[PDB]
Amino acid sequence: AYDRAITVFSPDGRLFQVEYAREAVKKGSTALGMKFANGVLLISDKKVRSRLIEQNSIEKIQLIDDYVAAVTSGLVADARVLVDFARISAQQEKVTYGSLVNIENLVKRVADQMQQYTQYGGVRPYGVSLIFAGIDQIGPRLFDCDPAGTINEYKATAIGSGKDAVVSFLEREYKENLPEKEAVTLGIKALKSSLEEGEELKAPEIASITVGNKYRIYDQEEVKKFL
Amino acid sequence: AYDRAITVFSPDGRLFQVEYAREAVKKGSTALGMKFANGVLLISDKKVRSRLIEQNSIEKIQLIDDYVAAVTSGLVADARVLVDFARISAQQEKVTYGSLVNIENLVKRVADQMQQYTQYGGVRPYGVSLIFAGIDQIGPRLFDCDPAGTINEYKATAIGSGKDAVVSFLEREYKENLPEKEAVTLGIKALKSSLEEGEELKAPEIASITVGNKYRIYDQEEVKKFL
Amino acid sequence: AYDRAITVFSPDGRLFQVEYAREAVKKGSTALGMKFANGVLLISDKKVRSRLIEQNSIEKIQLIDDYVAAVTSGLVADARVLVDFARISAQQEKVTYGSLVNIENLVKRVADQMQQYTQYGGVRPYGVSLIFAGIDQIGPRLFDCDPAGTINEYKATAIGSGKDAVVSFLEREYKENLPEKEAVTLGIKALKSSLEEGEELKAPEIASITVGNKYRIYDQEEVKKFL
Amino acid sequence: AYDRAITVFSPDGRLFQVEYAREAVKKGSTALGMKFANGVLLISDKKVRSRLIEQNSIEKIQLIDDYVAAVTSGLVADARVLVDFARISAQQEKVTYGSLVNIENLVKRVADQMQQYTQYGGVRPYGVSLIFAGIDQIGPRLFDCDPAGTINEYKATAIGSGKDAVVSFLEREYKENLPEKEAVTLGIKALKSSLEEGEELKAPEIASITVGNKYRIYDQEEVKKFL
Amino acid sequence: AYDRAITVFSPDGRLFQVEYAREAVKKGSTALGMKFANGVLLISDKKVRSRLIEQNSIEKIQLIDDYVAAVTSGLVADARVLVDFARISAQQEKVTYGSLVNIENLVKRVADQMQQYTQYGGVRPYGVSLIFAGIDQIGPRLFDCDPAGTINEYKATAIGSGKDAVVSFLEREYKENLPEKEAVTLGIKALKSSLEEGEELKAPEIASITVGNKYRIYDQEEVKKFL
Amino acid sequence: AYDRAITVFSPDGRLFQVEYAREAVKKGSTALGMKFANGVLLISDKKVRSRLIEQNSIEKIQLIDDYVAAVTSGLVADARVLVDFARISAQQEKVTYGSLVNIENLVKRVADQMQQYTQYGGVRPYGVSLIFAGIDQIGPRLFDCDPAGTINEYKATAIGSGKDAVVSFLEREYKENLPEKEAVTLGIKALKSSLEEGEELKAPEIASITVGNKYRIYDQEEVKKFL
Amino acid sequence: AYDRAITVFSPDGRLFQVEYAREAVKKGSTALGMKFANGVLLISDKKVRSRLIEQNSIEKIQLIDDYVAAVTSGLVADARVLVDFARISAQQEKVTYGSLVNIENLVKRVADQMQQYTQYGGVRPYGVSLIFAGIDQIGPRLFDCDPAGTINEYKATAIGSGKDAVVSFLEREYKENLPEKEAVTLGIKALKSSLEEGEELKAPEIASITVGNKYRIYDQEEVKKFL
Amino acid sequence: TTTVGITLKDAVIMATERRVTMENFIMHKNGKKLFQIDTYTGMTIAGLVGDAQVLVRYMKAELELYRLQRRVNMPIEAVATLLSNMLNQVKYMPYMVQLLVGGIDTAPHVFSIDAAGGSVEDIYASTGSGSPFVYGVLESQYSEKMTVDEGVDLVIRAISAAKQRDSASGGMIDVAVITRKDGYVQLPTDQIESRIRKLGLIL
Amino acid sequence: TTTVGITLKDAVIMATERRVTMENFIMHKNGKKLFQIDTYTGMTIAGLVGDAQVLVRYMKAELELYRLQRRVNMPIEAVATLLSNMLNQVKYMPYMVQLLVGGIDTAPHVFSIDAAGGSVEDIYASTGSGSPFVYGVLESQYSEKMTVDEGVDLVIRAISAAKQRDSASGGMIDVAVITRKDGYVQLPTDQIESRIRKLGLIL
């Protein structure tokens, strides 16, 4: 009766459409990130199938600008378009003010975009969740966002399939000011446990940035070193 | 038959959609506020889960401007966007008239915004209720607003989950010109009783302002002092 | 079959949506007014609940301008927004012509506003009825308006819950040129009988204006004097 | 199956919505008019209820301009708004051309207005019928109009509840160039017979105009003279 | 299943709505026309009811301009509005080009108007058919048009109720270059046979035009002469 | 379940509405064309009924411009309006570029027009198919187009009722560079066989153009010569 | 229950409409492409029916500009219109920037176009998938796109009917830097195996481009050489 | 270019000459400036041709439509008024023209209309390049007690005079007289030139 | 630049020269100023090339479209009015041009059209830089009782004269005669230059 149309509050105060959307994201790949020493890092599980896929081309961690990256989970198409929006939106703040001072703001704009489809009648919501990570005027910052447009800042978090799992590991073994090398480790370990019901961690995709400079994408061998 | 679509009066004169919306807010966290000595205070129950959440970042009492704050309950996303609207709306009155003389007016604008989705066909109402508190040209003022766009000024009130409960406590033990220290106490006591079916009050979020100056957000230890 | 959608004439020539709307107003509070000596007065039953409500703040008789007031019944939200419309609409006539010469006109505009939602497809009608009272270029005037946009001028009338009742009392004991003191009495008596199935009249809200000057809102004690 | 929605021709070539609308008008009060000597007159049955209604204020015969009046039957609200449209529409022809030369044209415009809602999808038709009477450049003229936008010129006619009845009386006893006094009589007699299943004719509302001058509304006593 | 909504092709390639519309026209009065000697004539069956109708005022053959007339059948309201459209549309060609050279074009415009409602979603088609007759730069011309927007030029034809009948008579006894007097006769005879299941032909409405001059409407007696 | 609404892909990847549309065209008259010697010809079966129709006026092969013609099949109204569109569209290319260099382009525009109604929600598709033939900058060209907006260039083809039939005949006996006289013959023969289940070919409508000059419409006798 | 309307997430997080769309593409012809030596090639199975079709005119590999081509699969009409969009879109980048530097961008624009119909309510998605191939500032590039707006870059891939099949062959026997002659071979072999359940490969359509120059479409004989 | 409308008892006469020139270059000897605009009404154009012409067509069609819709003819003051509104409505990018509209409804009438939609009724009035000259003879010899025939002569005289003192006017002078009895009738060229000769006038 | 349309008995003849210049810099020796616009009608362009050309194309098409939809050719006064409407409608940002449209429907015609949509028909008229000169000779030797052949000569003469007294005009003069019998036919260059030589004219 109440779960066929997205418009519309249910008798219990819920937007079923936005819920159904959330479902789509759970079925998405698993990724996480966390603040560490003097930067923040992002790590996504790059689960590959055929030998025929062009490897790296399936980049899950995408750059918004040299100092801010984001990783997404959910309907791939929706994620892409929502990424590009943030990209140009980023550029916009740069060209008017001369500098993207607060990253929090960047996420808020993209969040509001998503929030709009939450109420404007004829249009399906964005079936995706993502997290933005980078260092701004305030310092290293970590945010996540869901199809509802809800946004929160973390010390560490995850998203996608094995969220509940990996998140609990961190919830437990997360170490405040863990230096990069150890942080990436704790992370990869956390990512493992979670999705690793299927043993093989495969080839994770990892990148990081530290206050004072631009983002660094880990090379095949470097990541394989922690793997 | 009559409870599937929000457009539309029911045979008994009710907007079912707006009702369903109200439901969503009941399932929201509990918060309250009250006028006291020569100011007004706001207090929200900051119920936390994981060790992995970034503590304070989940600020429930938000500032609109140095002299007016508001706390919300309901669909988080809806609350955020509705907050920012009030913020810029606030700025607008400042830039034209040179001063936000009457706060009542600020709430009225945001209320009307919500009232619009109450009748303009294709669009889901705002599933949220909130209260604005602050001191204006007239003095300390306290208002609350529901998804219907209904707005009222109080001497003390609450909203969210344990509204009925906490409100009754105040309804009974509310003391007119209670000096800040005692007021925050009565409040925290009232908040306790209500939601405290589950014993632990956890860490409440409290802030206050007094005529003559800007808002003051209570620090972890200060609040723990009344806790 | 014919009572689920508001668009649309029924096989018997009726706008069911507008009917359903009327229902909502019946469930509204009771209020009335009447012309008297050389002015007109308005009186509404201010039925209060909790000790926690901010008393007077729940003003049912609202001013449109120093010489014209109105009282409403139905969906509170709808009433508020429709009030403000009349307010600015009032201002508009003042600024172009220099003077709100005929009040009848003010009500007609707000009526037409309501009439529009009676036929323009995608939008729910205004679930409210109200009465405007005041003295204009023509003299003391009394009008009422329903969700259908129907408007009529009276010598005395009521609206809300106990309409049928109170109206009949007046229909019977209404005295043409009753001087203010006696008029307010007859009124309060009439209001009593009606809603007074529940004995206690509580604290009624009453205001009046007389040709030659501005509106006067009765103070707590003054009203209690007739109570 | 075919009688629930107004859009749309039925398998037999009929606009059910417009039909349902017609129903609403039948349930309207009864009124008629006819051309006579050197003018035309209008007469409506002013059936009153409560002592509490403001008598004359419930004017059924309304002026469009000093030389043209109209009387309506059907949804009161719809009638009012459609009247005002004709009024300003009248003014418009006056201001451009300098003179409302042909009244037929005035009715055509208002008719077309109604015809539009006959086909433009999302919007309920005007549930009302009315007749325009007055003397123009061509002379005394009499027109009637239904919710379908159909318009016709008569020598005499009626509308509302007792149409069929009163119309038949005239159809039979209508006298071509009957001088005013006798014409109003024949009319009132005709109006009587029809609705007078309930004996009492009550207080009819009658007005007339004659070539060479403006409209004349009959005073209480004058009408009571023929009554 | 497929006959409730007009939007939309049926599984067999038909616009049911346009069909239902056609039905409405069949139930319309009967009229016809034909080219003759050096002009063309139009004739409609003016079937009257009450003595109370204003005779001639119910003109079925309407002028578009001194050299082109048209007669219609179907929903009266729809016919009127569609007539006026052609009228102004006619004027338009006159004012730009200086002369309505080809009448065919006039009908095409009005046809396209009707064709639009054949596909543009939310709006009911024009329930009417009509025929245009007159003499243009090319000579005497005869066209007919249905609710579908289909238009064809004839040597003689009919429309309305008794189409099939009268058309067959002509189909058989139509005489190419029949001089006016004999042409009107053949016509009236043809019109008779058809609708004359009910014996009495009543008072037909007939008009004609001949190359070289303007249209001529037959007077009561003249028509009665052929009757 | 899936065949009632045109919006919308079926579970098997088909636009049912566009299919239903195709049906309408099959029930259309039969016509064909083919390239020959140094031109191309068009031929349509002009199946007539009543003696009362104005013969030639029912032209099925229509000119777009002196060097390009087209013949259509399906809902007549839809065909007409779609023809005129191509006509003005043709004119447009002429006025900007100075010359309609590629005819292929002309058809593409009209095709896109039709393709739009294939997806833009509220509007019924064009129930018609047609073929354009003529000689352009490239030479003699032959195209066909269906309600889906699909367009293809042929050496010879047909459309309407007997498509499958006539097409197969050609598919078999089509002769590449057949000189006009023989080409028209093969054609008429092919047209015959197909629709000629009913023996009589009646009076076909045929026209042709040859590189170097304008189109030539065959006269009654000339066509009767091949008949 | 959940598979009748495209708007709208299913309880499991899927856009059924977009799925149904995908179905339409599977039923499309088979085509593939792959990067090789120093260019990239495209090859489509040109499966023909009647002798009456104009052979080559049914070009499946279409040019966007001298250095970039694309081949499509799905609803033919949808494919055409989406092609032209890319064409002008291509031109646009050329005219502003002076050069189409990154082809990836061209596909992204057309992808976003498709993504829009994925959520904007009233409009059916594009039932088509296609692949763009060409050499840009970066070098030879290969992309594919589905009705969802999802886009990916390949080393080799296929689309249409026999995707799964042909793709697996490549997935297995694809040779990195295979020189053109051998690459086209491997391709044609791969295309064969797949769709070749029906033995005859018929006449494939093949074209290629190599860094340093424009695209080359293989001539009938040349392709027949590898066939 | 000169035109004139004159009122008398039960008729209204209207005449104009017909030379159209571009400064000194007289380019067209036979233009038309007198137009019947409705069964019982006529209008005289004066000013910029383009504007004048389009304005005339508008007026024509508008009048025809109104007649059909209202079943009666539009009153002279009414058509003046309409024109007034149109013109004034666009005063800041006007139809540089000067119109004279005469006709007879319940009585005879003649209105002078200026490009700013100013409209005024007189018992006679002239429009055009030669206006003053004709205003002279008229002010000198017009009498409301004249006959339609005396009228047509007067008019012919007046314009003939203007033709003498105004290089911008010329050509065959043509008249149309409108009465309720016969409606709007334009006199035959020969009869006009005959009266010219008889009167001892020229051209 | 100079063009001329001349009416006679049962034909209409139009001719123009063809030098296109930029002030004193005669940049193009062979422009085209005469265009067939419909089976039984032609037009002559004069003024700014940009505006004229676009104008010719619009007209050309507008006419062909009209023919097809109405099954009959547009009348000459109709084409002239159409044009008149277009030009006046944009008088404040006008097509700086001066058009002459000749043709034959029920009878021969020739209309003069200015940048403001002023349209007026004459028995003959000239357009362009050299207008005066031709108007001089035409005024002097034209007669409505001439034969189409006499006409073609008169015209050539008229243009050759203007070519002498007007530096803006020049080059090969070309003519086209349009009759109901044969339609719009443009005369063979040779034949034209032949008549020139015969007449003892020059260029």
Swiss-Prot record, chains A, B, C, D, E, F, G:
Keywords: Cytoplasm, Proteasome. Changing K60A: Prevents PAN to associate with the proteasome and stimulate gate opening. The formation of the proteasomal ATPase PAN-20S proteasome complex, via the docking of the C-termini of PAN into the intersubunit pockets in the alpha-rings, triggers opening of the gate for substrate entry. Interconversion between the open-gate and close-gate conformations leads to a dynamic regulation of the 20S proteasome proteolysis activity. The keyword Cytoplasm applies. It comes from the Archaea. GO terms for cellular component: cytoplasm; proteasome core complex, alpha-subunit complex. GO terms for biological process: proteasomal protein catabolic process; ubiquitin-dependent protein catabolic process. InterPro entries: Ntn_hydrolases_N, Proteasome_alpha, Proteasome_alpha-type, Proteasome_asu_arc, Proteasome_asu_N, Proteasome_sua/b. Its main location: cytoplasm. CDD domains: proteasome_alpha_archeal (cd03756). It is found in: Cytoplasm. The N-terminus is blocked. Signal peptide: none annotated. One of its GO terms (molecular function) is threonine-type endopeptidase activity. The configuration of the closed gate contains an opening large enough to allow rapid entry of tetrapeptides but able to impede the entry of proteins and longer peptides. Belongs to the peptidase T1A family. Component of the proteasome core, a large protease complex with broad specificity involved in protein degradation. The T.acidophilum proteasome is able to cleave oligopeptides after Tyr, Leu, Phe, and to a lesser extent after Glu and Arg. Thus, displays chymotrypsin-like activity and low level of caspase-like and trypsin-like activities. The 20S proteasome core is composed of 14 alpha and 14 beta subunits that assemble into four stacked heptameric rings, resulting in a barrel-shaped structure. The two inner rings, each composed of seven catalytic beta subunits, are sandwiched by two outer rings, each composed of seven alpha subunits. The catalytic chamber with the active sites is on the inside of the barrel. Has a gated structure, the ends of the cylinder being occluded by the N-termini of the alpha-subunits. Is capped at one or both ends by the proteasome regulatory ATPase, PAN. This is Proteasome subunit alpha. It comes from Thermoplasma acidophilum (strain ATCC 25905 / DSM 1728 / JCM 9062 / NBRC 15155 / AMRC-C165).
UniProtKB/Swiss-Prot annotation, chains H, I:
GO terms for cellular component: cytoplasm; proteasome core complex, beta-subunit complex. GO terms for biological process: proteasomal protein catabolic process. Its main location: cytoplasm. It catalyses: Cleavage of peptide bonds with very broad specificity. It holds the Pfam family Proteasome. The active site is at T1 (nucleophile). Its EC number is 3.4.25.1. The formation of the proteasomal ATPase PAN-20S proteasome complex, via the docking of the C-termini of PAN into the intersubunit pockets in the alpha-rings, triggers opening of the gate for substrate entry. Interconversion between the open-gate and close-gate conformations leads to a dynamic regulation of the 20S proteasome proteolysis activity. It comes from the Archaea. It is found in: Cytoplasm. Keywords: Autocatalytic cleavage, Cytoplasm, Hydrolase, Protease, Proteasome, Threonine protease, Zymogen. GO terms for molecular function: endopeptidase activity; threonine-type endopeptidase activity. InterPro entries: Ntn_hydrolases_N, Pept_T1A_Psome_bsu_arc, Pept_T1A_subB, Proteasome_bsu_CS, Proteasome_sua/b, Proteasome_suB-type. Belongs to the peptidase T1B family. PANTHER family: ATP-DEPENDENT PROTEASE SUBUNIT HSLV (PTHR32194:SF0), METALLOPROTEASE TLDD (PTHR32194). The configuration of the closed gate contains an opening large enough to allow rapid entry of tetrapeptides but able to impede the entry of proteins and longer peptides. The 20S proteasome core is composed of 14 alpha and 14 beta subunits that assemble into four stacked heptameric rings, resulting in a barrel-shaped structure. The two inner rings, each composed of seven catalytic beta subunits, are sandwiched by two outer rings, each composed of seven alpha subunits. The catalytic chamber with the active sites is on the inside of the barrel. Has a gated structure, the ends of the cylinder being occluded by the N-termini of the alpha-subunits. Is capped at one or both ends by the proteasome regulatory ATPase, PAN. Component of the proteasome core, a large protease complex with broad specificity involved in protein degradation. The T.acidophilum proteasome is able to cleave oligopeptides after Tyr, Leu, Phe, and to a lesser extent after Glu and Arg. Thus, displays chymotrypsin-like activity and low level of caspase-like and trypsin-like activities. This is Proteasome subunit beta. It comes from Thermoplasma acidophilum (strain ATCC 25905 / DSM 1728 / JCM 9062 / NBRC 15155 / AMRC-C165).
